[PDB]
Structure formats: C-alpha cells, structure tokens
Design a protein around this nucleic acid. Structure first.
Ligand SMILES: [Mg+2]
Ligand SMILES: [Mg+2]
Ligand SMILES: [Mg+2]
Ligand SMILES: [Mg+2]
Ligand SMILES: [Mg+2]
Ligand SMILES: [Mg+2]
Ligand SMILES: [Mg+2]
Ligand SMILES: [Mg+2]
Ligand SMILES: [Mg+2]
Ligand SMILES: [Mg+2]
Ligand SMILES: [Mg+2]
Ligand SMILES: [Mg+2]
Length: 70
RNA sequence: AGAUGGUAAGGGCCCACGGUGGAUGCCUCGGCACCCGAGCCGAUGAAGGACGUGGCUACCUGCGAUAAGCCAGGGGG
C-alpha cells in the first residue's frame, strides 16, 4: 500500500470506535478470504493485495488495541 | 660342415602426453590466546523448544493467527 494511504488509514482508523474497528476488521478478514480463494484458483495476478490486506488488518487491530489499552 | 641375424604372446628400463588422486603454495567467511569492556534472566511465564507463518517456499533466518511482520520516537538518504 502507498505510504500516504497508510497514514490515511491510521488517521481514519484512529477516529473510529472499538466497535467500528471490530466491524471493519471483520470485513477485511472477509475480503482476505475472498482473495485467498482467488489466489488458489489462479485468478489473482495482483498478489501484492494479500500482503496489504493482512497488514491493514494488523494496523487496525493494533489501533483497536490502542483504544482499549487505557 | 660351420657360423651369424630379423620373431615379441607378453614383459622390463627410459621419454612424451594424458587419466585418477588431492599433496603443496597462495588465499580466508572461521578459529585461538591475551587484554579491556560488560555481566544476570524468570509467574508481566524465562532458558530452551514444538507447530505454524511467503501469491508460488524444501531448508536457514525473521516473526507469532496482527505471524520475513503492527504502532511510535530517534538515526540515515
Ligand atoms: Mg634368431
Ligand atoms: Mg617387445
Ligand atoms: Mg601385443
Ligand atoms: Mg627384466
Ligand atoms: Mg597427469
Ligand atoms: Mg604466507
Ligand atoms: Mg551475560
Ligand atoms: Mg523462547
Ligand atoms: Mg521457522
Ligand atoms: Mg508499515
Ligand atoms: Mg521508524
Ligand atoms: Mg523515521
């Protein structure tokens, strides 16, 4: 993902609530499964997408944790 | 009558060139010694592991379902 889009993800994420973070992670985890399936039948040429999503989910969960941590 | 040479199945010595083999010289990612520095970790679960972890991944390294990585500060260019 582009560095600027990462900052953007963090700012937008940091504005969210725990619950909104949970919904969004769950959606991204879903979107990853779709990607996995496509990789397995050979229809995902754009395979950088998998590394990306996995890190968005990390970043989000990382932030969720920030939120709950205090 | 007499007498003396060309035989090489193969062998031997020498010479040339090779094959095998990995000495020797040079080399060094490594080791060794001394000196200096520095010296605890663990229930906030250690040391050390198992199994995982990559779009394609046998192994090693890294990492832990947030899985060759997540956030922030500093450095660097
Ligand atoms: Mg004769
Ligand atoms: Mg002969
Ligand atoms: Mg002969
Ligand atoms: Mg002889
Ligand atoms: Mg020879
Ligand atoms: Mg020498
Ligand atoms: Mg020590
Ligand atoms: Mg350990
Ligand atoms: Mg491993
Ligand atoms: Mg990042
Ligand atoms: Mg940094
Ligand atoms: Mg920086």
């Amino acid at each position: 993902m582009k560095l600027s889009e990462v900052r953007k993800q963090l700012e937008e994420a940091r504005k969210l609530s725990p619950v909104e973070l949970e919904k969004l992670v769950r959606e991204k985890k879903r979107e990853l499964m779709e990607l996995r399936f496509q990789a397995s039948i050979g229809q995902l040429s754009q395979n950088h997408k998998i590394r990306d999503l996995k890190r968005q989910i990390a970043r989000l969960l990382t932030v969720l944790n920030e939120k709950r941590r205090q």
